[PDB]
């Protein structure tokens, strides 16, 4: 009981976030009673939380050695192995825990989680059900299951699930315990802005607790530019400098920064994945530092202090790979959220969120913990101009007698191929070449229908858009610009040559009952037309098909394609007429993708940052007519775009031109505007004020 009292205290000191004192106490417990299984296992869990994973494992095994049937040690060891990427060891432990005790609900939930992460959603669902059946009051398992069901669009008892998620969160915040809804997901559920902000705040608070063991004073922050030769030192922190959407958005930014006034440091939180994305940020940033090499957060945060960073930019928020502990230690006087996280951090350690007036209006500043810092057009950016310049221009083949989106050719050398052809008609819009149905035209369409990889016409290489990974796998990922002429057609994706194609290329989780109802309403109003979605994942397809049958729609109306390599995804958006944006959470990166194809996107901005991004893109692009203030307006815009064929031609033309004329895809301009705002943020601080809203 001397030992027990130390252990029980340590357990409470841990629930409190007092991690150092918990450790001392478990050690003191083991000093007093060495053969104490539960204190080994508890010490192991807190060593795991601190990142000391080998030490943790050692205590888990001691605990198991003392009590061979201690299922909870196996279950928590499982988690430690999973955090070390030893998926096999994790599974060997979880399953051993469930063999020892099949009624052990925590083990079931942990197994479910590793099922979900591995891509086995039906098994994750089954195992969370088992957990909830063994322990019906189990917030983590319930909310994590609610996410799996979201992912595959299972909306069985949707309305009660939703209010159940809200009361769990209310109840968790009452008791100031960590909410089981993850902050990144909180935009999907009908919670108050207060709750979303508090969810975030509580997750930021974990980071504050992990760093207190280090006992670091506040750092001393440079108050003028004088020892950095008059340059604002800016530090971009990301797990995503590699093959990740973040790099697909901002890889050109670092190297566009003005080196007379700015000095750029990229802090990678991930190791080098071998991709051009990584190579480019490493080459073009003034300094590149691999923090994944320096796991200790105090030592890593030191580097950032000694580099001299003025502004430290958090590109992760609450996403995978985050090390927000870095920002909790405040190695810099200005710390801003940018681009990668579509929400508020909720934490005191972040000063601004870089956003914009259309995304985060003045009125809803209470949504965020941070002060608003406006970019002048949209905060969103895309590297599409650099990545996919072969999509700047297109040509078509005229199959009968003229469509912009049926049979499409793109290529760096397309002009020259065209000029090699006997008859080619130009159609004003600036212009779209049309290849009439010659022998040449027929050879192409045959390669497609035959599933052939490529053919040669007049010395030019003509590639099947379905086969890019076989021709050049770096061009499929967007790492290289394709060096051939590529053909893309509705035929390849089983789309009708003779009807309207509405699209949405997002992960299926962004869809909800209301949203699919609106889509159904639109398709019923526009006979012939189809809705073009992705298998993202594939096991969500029958749920979507069934809920749409129930709403009115015959089956043939919704066509699913596989997820494609990056360049094919962006290229194929050309085959659509219109994109219907998800209002619950908009296409963000996916919105830029569709617009770069020239495809107009209809959207209904909501309240959340996540539900207003597409509206900011369209504003910047200058297509206010595509933004709806309610559901009836969205369906009328979309039905109008599928029936008024001349207005469709006009709207398309505007998107097609304005993707070049507008600022949307103008990385140099974006960068220069980002620079102004960074300097605004710096002035307002050197004149010793503290963060305030910038507009």
């Amino acid at each position: 009981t001397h030992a027990d009292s130390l252990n029980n205290l340590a357990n409470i000191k841990r629930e409190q976030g007092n991690i150092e004192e918990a450790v001392r106490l478990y050690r003191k417990a083991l000093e007093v009673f060495p053969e104490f299984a539960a204190a080994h296992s508890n010490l192991a869990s807190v060593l795991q939380q601190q990142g000391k994973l080998q030490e943790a494992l050692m205590h888990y095994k001691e605990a198991i050695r003392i009590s061979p049937t201690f299922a909870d040690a196996y279950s928590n060891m499982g988690n430690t192995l999973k955090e070390m990427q030893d998926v096999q060891g994790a599974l060997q432990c979880y399953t051993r825990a469930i063999q020892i005790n099949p009624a052990f609900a925590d083990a079931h939930s942990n197994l479910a989680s590793i099922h979900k992460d591995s891509g086995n959603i039906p098994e994750a669902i089954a195992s969370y059900r088992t957990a909830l059946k063994l322990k019906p009051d189990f917030p983590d398992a319930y909310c994590n299951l609610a996410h799996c069901l979201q992912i595959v669009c299972d909306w069985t008892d949707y309305d009660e699930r939703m209010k159940k998620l809200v009361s769990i969160v209310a109840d968790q915040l009452e008791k100031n315990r960590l909410p089981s809804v993850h902050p990144h997901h909180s935009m999907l559920y009908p919670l108050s802005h207060g709750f979303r902000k508090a969810i975030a705040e509580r997750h930021g608070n974990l980071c504050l607790d992990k760093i207190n063991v280090l006992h670091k004073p506040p750092y001393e922050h440079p108050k003028d530019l004088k020892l950095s030769d008059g340059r604002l030192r800016v530090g971009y922190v990301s797990s995503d400098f590699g093959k990740h959407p973040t790099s697909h958005l901002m890889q050109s930014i670092p190297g566009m920064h003005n080196p007379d006034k700015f000095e750029v440091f990229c802090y990678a939180l991930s190791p080098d994945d071998g991709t051009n994305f990584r190579v480019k940020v490493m080459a073009e940033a003034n300094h590149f530092i691999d923090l994944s090499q320096i796991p200790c957060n105090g030592k890593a945060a030191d580097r950032i202090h000694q580099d001299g960073i003025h502004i430290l930019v958090n590109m992760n928020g609450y996403t995978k790979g985050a090390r927000n502990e870095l920002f909790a230690l405040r190695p810099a006087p200005i710390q801003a959220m940018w681009l990668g996280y579509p929400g508020t951090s909720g934490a005191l350690f972040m000063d601004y969120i870089i956003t914009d007036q259309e995304t985060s209006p003045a009125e809803v500043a209470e949504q965020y913990s941070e002060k608003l810092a406006y970019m002048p057009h949209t905060f969103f950016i895309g590297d599409h101009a650099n990545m996919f310049p072969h999509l700047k221009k297109k040509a078509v083949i005229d199959f009968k007698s003229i469509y912009d989106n049926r049979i499409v050719l793109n290529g760096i050398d397309l002009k020259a191929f065209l000029d090699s052809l006997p008859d080619v008609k130009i159609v004003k819009m600036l212009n779209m070449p049309v290849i009439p149905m010659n022998t040449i035209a027929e050879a192409v369409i045959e390669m497609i229908n035959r599933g052939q990889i490529q053919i040669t016409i007049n010395g030019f290489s003509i590639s099947n858009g379905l086969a890019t990974t076989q021709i050049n796998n770096k061009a499929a990922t967007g790492e290289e610009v394709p060096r051939t002429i590529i053909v893309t057609t509705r035929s390849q994706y089983g789309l009708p040559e003779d009807a309207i194609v509405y699209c949405n290329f997002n992960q299926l989780y962004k869809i909800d009952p209301s949203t699919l109802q609106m889509w159904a309403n639109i398709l019923k109003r526009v006979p012939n037309s189809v809705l073009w979605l992705l298998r993202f994942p594939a096991v969500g397809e029958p749920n979507i098909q069934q809920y749409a049958q129930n709403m009115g729609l015959p089956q043939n109306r919704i066509i699913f394609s596989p997820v494609a390599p990056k360049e094919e995804h962006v290229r194929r958006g050309q085959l659509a007429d219109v994109c219907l944006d998800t209002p619950l959470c908009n296409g963000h990166t996916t919105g830029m993708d569709v617009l770069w194809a020239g495809t107009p996107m209809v959207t209904m901005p909501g309240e959340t940052l996540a539900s207003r991004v597409a509206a900011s893109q369209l504003t910047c692009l200058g297509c206010l007519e595509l933004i709806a203030k309610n559901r009836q307006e969205y369906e009328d815009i979309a039905v109008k775009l599928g029936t008024d064929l001349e207005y469709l031609k006009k709207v398309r033309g505007k998107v097609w031109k304005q993707r070049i004329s507008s600022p949307l895809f103008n990385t140099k301009q974006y960068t220069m505007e980002l620079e102004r705002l960074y300097l605004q943020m710096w002035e307002h601080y050197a004149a010793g004020n503290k963060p305030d809203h910038m507009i």
Binding site: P245, T319, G340
Partner: peptide, 5 residues
Amino acid sequence: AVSRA
């Protein structure tokens, strides 16, 4: 290759 919690 996606943004994830």
